[PDB]
Amino acid sequence: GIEWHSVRDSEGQKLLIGVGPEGISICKDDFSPINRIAYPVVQMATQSGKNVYLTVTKESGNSIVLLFKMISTRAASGLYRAITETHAFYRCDTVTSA
Fold it and tell me: What is the effect of changing residue 80 to A?
């Protein structure tokens, strides 16, 4: 079901990002879980060439940025689209009586 994307963190550690129904899943290359990020916590998503940045809200109230380095601009666009468009499936909104 979930589409896993190959990324590298700030240090260079190989990770796997899984975009699912509840949110973002961060794992190691052997799929061992590390952390999970729910979509309401995700404030923003940014793409700068091969890189993808995420603005995450903390339970404290403040916002911090997560960096994900990728092999190509098409790989980054694939992860950016996954976070942005599976949000147009998570966060739905329309009129009823038109």
Answer: Unable to clear LDLR from the plasma membrane
